[PDB]
Amino acid sequence: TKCTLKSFTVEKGIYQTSNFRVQPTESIVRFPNITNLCPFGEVFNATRF
Amino acid sequence: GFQPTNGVGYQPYRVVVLSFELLHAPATVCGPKKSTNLVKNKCVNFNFNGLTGTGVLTESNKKFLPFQQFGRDIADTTDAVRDPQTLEILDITPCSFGGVSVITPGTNTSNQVAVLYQGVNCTEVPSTGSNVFQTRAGCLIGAEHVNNSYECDIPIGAGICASYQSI
Amino acid sequence: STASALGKLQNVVNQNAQALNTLVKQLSSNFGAISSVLNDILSRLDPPE
Amino acid sequence: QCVNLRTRTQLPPAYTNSFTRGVYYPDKVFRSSVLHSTQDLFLPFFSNVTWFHNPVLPFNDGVYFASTEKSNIIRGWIFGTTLDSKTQSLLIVNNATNVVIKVCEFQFCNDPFLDVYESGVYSSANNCTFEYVSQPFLKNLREFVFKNIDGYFKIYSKHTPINLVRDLPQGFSALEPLVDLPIGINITRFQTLLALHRSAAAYYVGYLQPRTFLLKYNENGTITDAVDCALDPLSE
Ligand SMILES: *[C@@H]1O[C@H](CO)[C@@H](O[C@@H]2O[C@H](CO)[C@@H](O)[C@H](O)[C@H]2NC(C)=O)[C@H](O)[C@H]1NC(C)=O
Ligand SMILES: *[C@@H]1O[C@H](CO)[C@@H](O[C@@H]2O[C@H](CO)[C@@H](O)[C@H](O)[C@H]2NC(C)=O)[C@H](O)[C@H]1NC(C)=O
Ligand SMILES: *[C@@H]1O[C@H](CO)[C@@H](O[C@@H]2O[C@H](CO)[C@@H](O)[C@H](O)[C@H]2NC(C)=O)[C@H](O)[C@H]1NC(C)=O
Ligand SMILES: *[C@@H]1O[C@H](CO)[C@@H](O[C@@H]2O[C@H](CO)[C@@H](O)[C@H](O)[C@H]2NC(C)=O)[C@H](O)[C@H]1NC(C)=O
Ligand SMILES: *[C@@H]1O[C@H](CO)[C@@H](O[C@@H]2O[C@H](CO)[C@@H](O)[C@H](O)[C@H]2NC(C)=O)[C@H](O)[C@H]1NC(C)=O
Ligand SMILES: *[C@@H]1O[C@H](CO)[C@@H](O[C@@H]2O[C@H](CO)[C@@H](O)[C@H](O)[C@H]2NC(C)=O)[C@H](O)[C@H]1NC(C)=O
Ligand SMILES: *[C@@H]1O[C@H](CO)[C@@H](O[C@@H]2O[C@H](CO)[C@@H](O)[C@H](O)[C@H]2NC(C)=O)[C@H](O)[C@H]1NC(C)=O
Ligand SMILES: *[C@@H]1O[C@H](CO)[C@@H](O)[C@H](O)[C@H]1NC(C)=O
Numbered sequence A: 001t002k003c004t005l006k007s008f009t010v011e012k013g014i015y016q017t018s019n020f021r022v023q024p025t026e027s028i029v030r031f032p033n034i035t036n037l038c039p040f041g042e043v044f045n046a047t048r049f
Numbered sequence B: 001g002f003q004p005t006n007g008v009g010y011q012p013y014r015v016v017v018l019s020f021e022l023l024h025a026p027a028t029v030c031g032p033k034k035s036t037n038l039v040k041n042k043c044v045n046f047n048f049n050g051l052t053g054t055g056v057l058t059e060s061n062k063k064f065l066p067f068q069q070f071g072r073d074i075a076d077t078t079d080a081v082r083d084p085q086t087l088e089i090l091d092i093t094p095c096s097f098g099g100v101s102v103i104t105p106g107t108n109t110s111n112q113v114a115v116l117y118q119g120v121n122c123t124e125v126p127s128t129g130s131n132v133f134q135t136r137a138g139c140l141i142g143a144e145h146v147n148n149s150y151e152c153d154i155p156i157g158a159g160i161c162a163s164y165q166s167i
Numbered sequence C: 001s002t003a004s005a006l007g008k009l010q011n012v013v014n015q016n017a018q019a020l021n022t023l024v025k026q027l028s029s030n031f032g033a034i035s036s037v038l039n040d041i042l043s044r045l046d047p048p049e
Numbered sequence D: 001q002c003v004n005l006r007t008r009t010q011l012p013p014a015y016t017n018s019f020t021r022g023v024y025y026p027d028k029v030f031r032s033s034v035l036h037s038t039q040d041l042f043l044p045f046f047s048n049v050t051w052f053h054n055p056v057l058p059f060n061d062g063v064y065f066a067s068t069e070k071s072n073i074i075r076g077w078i079f080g081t082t083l084d085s086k087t088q089s090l091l092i093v094n095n096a097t098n099v100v101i102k103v104c105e106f107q108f109c110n111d112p113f114l115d116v117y118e119s120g121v122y123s124s125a126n127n128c129t130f131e132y133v134s135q136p137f138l139k140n141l142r143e144f145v146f147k148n149i150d151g152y153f154k155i156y157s158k159h160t161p162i163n164l165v166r167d168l169p170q171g172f173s174a175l176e177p178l179v180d181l182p183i184g185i186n187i188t189r190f191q192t193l194l195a196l197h198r199s200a201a202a203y204y205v206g207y208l209q210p211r212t213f214l215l216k217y218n219e220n221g222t223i224t225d226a227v228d229c230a231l232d233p234l235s236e
């Protein structure tokens, strides 16, 4: 209050000093089900090259 | 002329070369996206299917059509989302915030004050200090609630105010 | 019975609501930039750019 | 079996009135009991929609297709520029079990027709790039909207039980999004396919223009009414 009012004495009343905000805790990432894999199996494990 | 005994230099080696092309057509192959689990009733930041934002998530009861992904109420502010895996509607609420104010009886008299958080429910204050009161104007810490009624000294709001006796 | 008698108060409320609505609507304009979301620009460009 | 039958059988190219048909959901956003104005490619109200009852019609920049039908003689569609193997071509076909979409350089017969004795329309097929199989699309009115933008082919569809005798009804129904395809292609003309047995059908075609519309969303997010801004001063 003294800092915002810039004085060493404060008169009777109510003063607004600052704000208040809740902070986030963690992060969440969601995406659809993983499927339709590329067919690398039949290329690398092909019998004949 | 491959033979079982030819040393490392003459062994047959299988070679596969991968070349990546970015023609102007839209991309059709991308790596796995990966995902985490779901939390609720906590102020977190989320990245639902590319839609990012902060807030607190609750279970809702809206009825999306089988093809919408998210909804907005008015002035283009998102309110509801659909999780890509479970396929249920979740509601987003901005994390609580507001101004703070100090009530003092004047440095001339004493130097004990009270704190008021404006428009903030008395559930997430921080800390504790002294007895805490919940009013239609917000939450108040550091004053005692009485049952009498006098002339108004320091107007607080919603028809209530404080004075000095303690505060 | 008759309505529209309290025109002035309704007009004041409508004007205030409309002003707030257009103020909050103004938050979705590029102003000649490349996007309207801060996070997209932060994650799609080098900070000096 | 690449044969030819005739040049014409009835040739009724006529015009009729669109009334207030051809509305589709512009995006995947949910809104409840609100009024929203949006600018996009639509079919103007009370437009002049062409009716046939079979040449290579132009595509321009979007197509609205309608057909009242029973026993679904119409099968699918063909899209492309030169309609030969010198450029990529799109084909959509349907049978009793699945819908098939292909993107290849075909050599279509001059008079495509399927019959049964899923080939015979294309004399060759090579350099195939995109394939897709899904659940089949199809007295009853079938409405479709075809759009192509930014290498994306969008299809909206709707089915309606009607009993009106001749033309489109004086109703209103939004068109739900159906299919999106990520293929780069330059569609400019298109053609319709009929699997008529060895022994010519009514369908309506309209075009789309960019304009602004006003839409009403009810409490459940369904579109119930629309207003075309540039129709008359009252609408403005
Ligand atoms: C080719 O086959 C081998 C043999 O199964 C694969 O190697 C296995 O990979 C799995 C994971 O996918 C591991 O759990 C096994 O331990 C591996 N076994 C051996 C002997 O290496 C290999 O992944 C296949 N190649 C491709 C490209 O899929
Ligand atoms: C994504 O995969 C998960 C894992 O299988 C699916 O979760 C299961 O869904 C079935 C569908 O009825 C349930 O019977 C199971 O109990 C679920 N498993 C759980 C909850 O552990 C999920 O449905 C998939 N999402 C899709 C396909 O969109
Ligand atoms: C501050 O938050 C609490 C916790 O949600 C609120 O208490 C809820 O009040 C509603 C309505 O009376 C009840 O249905 C819930 O069961 C209560 N929850 C709990 C945990 O008690 C409280 O009402 C909020 N403060 C204000 C002023 O609304
Ligand atoms: C309908 O069209 C499909 C288009 O391919 C025909 O082909 C069958 O498609 C299913 C679905 O993938 C496959 O499981 C079958 O193996 C395909 N058949 C063959 C011979 O490859 C299908 O036969 C057609 N059905 C009818 C009744 O006309
Ligand atoms: C066969 O298909 C391939 C794959 O799309 C074509 O190759 C590309 O075609 C596009 C379309 O003009 C070009 O922009 C690319 O530069 C081509 N890339 C390569 C590596 O060729 C090909 O043109 C098609 N036709 C033939 C005869 O091969
Ligand atoms: C679709 O058509 C456009 C124009 O009709 C093609 O754009 C041309 O692309 C070539 C090679 O990139 C350029 O040399 C030309 O100058 C472009 N023309 C114009 C008018 O911009 C585009 O390549 C075509 N795409 C396909 C897949 O056929
Ligand atoms: C919009 O959704 C509501 C909520 O489901 C629908 O109201 C239900 O409609 C069914 C079918 O007539 C009734 O069996 C239920 O009793 C209704 N529930 C309630 C709480 O009234 C409503 O029909 C939907 N459509 C419209 C136009 O409102
Ligand atoms: C408070 O004010 C009174 C008069 O205004 C003065 O006499 C007294 O000394 C003051 N007390 C302080 C400054 O502590």
Ligand SMILES: *[C@@H]1O[C@H](CO)[C@@H](O)[C@H](O)[C@H]1NC(C)=O
Binding pocket: B145, B146, B147
């Ligand atoms: C007096 O105050 C207490 C707590 O401050 C409250 O519970 C009570 O209802 C009030 N009134 C009476 C008559 O006790």
Ligand SMILES: *[C@@H]1O[C@H](CO)[C@@H](O)[C@H](O)[C@H]1NC(C)=O
Binding pocket: D015, D016, D017, D018, D046, D047, D048
């Ligand atoms: C369509 O245009 C023809 C002239 O080409 C006209 O005779 C007919 O009335 C029009 N139909 C409308 C505007 O519904």
